[PDB]
């Protein structure tokens, strides 16, 4: 007879210019500004988000799979890792003393609320493509689907590399955010109050945490792996060397774990990953010992061979089966979707890593190729936009990528052109490099000043 005394619900909405401004607001916290070095030196609170570029991206136009290695996707993946990790406890290896101010800037009411406000939009941008890459089910047809699930691409990339040890080290650092916080995304799913499945999931977590014994915690095992090949285990020392697809894979499990409407997707991906980890770890142990000899510590990997045989079975019989019985067959499409989305992300990671190692290994030839590409430009085979740049010593461009090929041409000075971990070129006057689209790179000026040009050729093959 009269209107409700409860005020109408205004749906959550954040888009367009207002969304852009909210993303810039989050990312202009000083702990996210560009690093003056290539490495974070035992400071887990500093993550490079290149905030100066964020005003210029279009967050409302969600990329499809052919575009998810473009720069805007890398930028969004970096943002999301930072947003998710505000829930995780980090202290420097050297102790908190001297780093309290950055600790307070990362764990602050403002930093969390700014990141949580933009997380829905960042998640659509990061994961929306999976809606197009991946109906009703019965328990019978799930069982058949599950019953039904060669050198690997990573093996071929590393073992066929011009520098196998460099390729393997670049591979290992991709796992640092995942393995050094191992099972933290999984732990998000055992908070709360639900059936016996909660206890079964917690048993899996107990093992990943080494039974509460720091010596045997899986993250500690991986520290030993990293240190045995001369890498460091402080997070995130190698932030600027994390590939887009590595962040995407790690962020997917924080997405599934934070958002409990996706709980049954996690249940499916847990089954697939736990079951797949035995073969993954067998291949990793074999490959690393081939590359490094007996100096490399692969206990991290062989421990999982021993344990994940049982974890995969635990997931199917003691997590999937009782949840399908309790909550009905309506949950099965989500279980399947978690498996099929994860498998898509793995394909993307294999491609992105393979492409990055090829790009690192090709650097000497891509320096030579600057000559014929430059001459094709001067001859007008391509009408390429050109940008002249002038930069002083130590001006370090934090790593990024471009969505088309570029020609970098040094007029005067000396540039360190960075293409991966352990992968660098010194470019002098009259020298340069062909920069391939979607490949991670950056640069630092080693001369007291550097004058250079960037030509936006699009497809360098048209200049030849």
Under rule CB under 8 A, residue 8 binds its own copies = yes
Under rule CB under 8 A, residue 258 binds its own copies = yes
Q: Are 278 and 323 in contact (CB under 8 A)?
A: no
**Binding piece for its own copies, criterion CB under 8 A, among 93-101, 141-149, 347-355, 405-413:** 93-101
State which residue, 10 or 144, has the beta carbon closest to its own copies.
10
Q: How far is the CB of 293 from its own copies (least distance, A)?
A: 28
Phi, psi of 389 (to 5 degrees): -135, 150
Report d(CA 418, CA 88) in Å as an integer: 31
Q: Helices 363-378 and 332-361, interaxial angle, to 10°?
A: 80
Residue 311: contacted member of Fe ion, its own copies, none (CB under 5 to 8 Å, by partner type): Fe ion
Under rule CB under 8 A, residue 299 binds its own copies = no
Report d(CA 419, CA 362) in Å as an integer: 10
**Binding piece for its own copies, criterion CB under 8 A, among 243-251, 328-336, 373-381, 434-442:** 328-336
State which residue, 208 or 405, has the beta carbon closest to its own copies.
208
Task: Determine whether the annotation assigns residue 182 to a binding site.
Answer: yes
Question: In b/e form, how buried is each residue of 424-460, taking b as 16+ CB within 10 angstroms?
Answer: bbebeeebbbbbbbbbbbbbbbebeebebbbbbbbeb
* Binds its own copies by CB under 8 A, chosen from 47, 78, 119, 237: 119
Residues 365-394 that bind its own copies (CB under 8 A): none
> Distance between alpha carbon 96 and the CA centroid of its chain, in Å?
26
Closest CA to 37 of 27, 48, 21, 23: 48
Q: How far is the CB of 182 from its own copies (least distance, A)?
A: 9
Question: In b/e form, how buried is each residue of 168-190, taking b as 16+ CB within 10 angstroms?
Answer: bbbbbbbbbbbbbbbbbbbbbbb
Residue 318: contacted member of Fe ion, its own copies, none (CB under 5 to 8 Å, by partner type): none
Task: Determine whether the annotation assigns residue 304 to a binding site.
Answer: yes
Under rule CB under 8 A, residue 71 binds its own copies = no
Under rule CB under 5 A, residue 455 binds Fe ion = no
Token pair, residue 280, equals 């993954």
Structural Rg of the chain based on CA atoms: 24
Residues 170-199 that bind its own copies (CB under 8 A): 180-181, 184, 187-196, 198-199
* Binds its own copies by CB under 8 A, chosen from 211, 293, 295, 380: 211
Task: Determine whether the annotation assigns residue 418 to a binding site.
Answer: no
* Binds its own copies by CB under 8 A, chosen from 40, 219, 298, 363: 219
Residue written as token pair 């995304």: 185
Binding site members for Fe(2+): 182, 208, 218, 274, 304, 308, 311, 400, 402, 441
Residues of the shown chain interacting with Fe ion in the complex, contacts defined by CB under 5 A: 208, 218, 274, 308, 311
């Amino acid at each position: 007879s009269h209107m409700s005394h409860v005020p109408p619900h205004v749906p959550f909405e954040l888009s367009g210019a207002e969304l852009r401004d909210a993303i810039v607001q989050y990312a202009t916290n000083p702990i996210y500004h560009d690093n003056l070095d290539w490495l974070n030196h035992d400071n887990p609170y500093r993550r490079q988000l290149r905030p100066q570029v964020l005003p210029h991206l279009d967050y409302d136009k969600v990329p499809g799979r052919e575009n998810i290695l473009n720069y805007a996707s890398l930028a969004v993946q970096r943002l999301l890792t930072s947003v998710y990790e505000a829930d995780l406890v980090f202290f420097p290896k050297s102790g908190l003393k001297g780093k309290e101010e950055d600790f307070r800037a990362f764990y602050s009411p403002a930093n969390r609320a700014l990141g949580e406000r933009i997380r829905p939009a960042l998640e659509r941008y990061a994961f929306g493509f999976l809606d197009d890459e991946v109906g009703t089910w019965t328990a019978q047809s799930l069982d058949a689907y599950l019953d039904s699930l060669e050198q690997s691409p990573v093996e071929k990339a590393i073992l066929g590399s011009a520098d196998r040890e460099r390729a393997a080290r670049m591979w290992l650092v991709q796992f640092a955010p995942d393995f050094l916080s191992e099972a933290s995304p999984m732990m998000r799913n055992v908070l709360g109050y639900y059936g016996p499945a909660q206890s079964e999931w917690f048993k899996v977590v107990i093992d990943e945490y080494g039974y509460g014994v720091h010596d045997t915690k899986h993250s500690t095992l991986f520290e030993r792996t990293l240190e045995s090949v001369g890498l460091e285990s402080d997070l995130h020392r190698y932030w600027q060397y994390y590939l887009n697809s590595s962040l995407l894979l790690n962020n997917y499990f924080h997405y599934l774990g934070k958002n409990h409407e996706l709980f049954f997707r996690y249940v499916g991906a847990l089954y697939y990953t736990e079951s797949s980890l035995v073969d993954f770890c067998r291949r990793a142990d074999h490959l690393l010992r081939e590359v490094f000899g007996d100096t490399v510590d692969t206990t991290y990997f062989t421990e999982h061979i021993h344990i994940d045989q049982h974890h995969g079975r635990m997931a199917r019989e003691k997590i999937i089966k009782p949840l399908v019985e309790a909550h009905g067959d309506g949950i099965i499409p989500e279980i399947v979707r978690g498996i099929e989305e994860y498998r898509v992300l793995l394909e993307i990671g294999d491609f992105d890593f393979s492409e990055q190692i090829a790009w690192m290994d090709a650097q000497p030839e891509l320096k030579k190729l600057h000559d014929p590409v430059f001459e094709g430009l001067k001859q007008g085979k391509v009408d390429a936009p050109v940008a002249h740049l002038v930069e002083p010593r130590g001006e370090l461009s934090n790593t990024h990528c471009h969505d088309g090929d570029e020609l970098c041409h040094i007029v005067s000075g000396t540039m360190r052109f960075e293409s991966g971990l352990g992968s660098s070129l010194t470019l002098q006057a009259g020298e340069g490099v062909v920069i391939k689209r979607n490949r991670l790179h950056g640069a630092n000026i080693e001369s007291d000043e550097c004058v250079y040009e960037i030509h936006s050729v699009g497809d360098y093959r048209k200049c030849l």
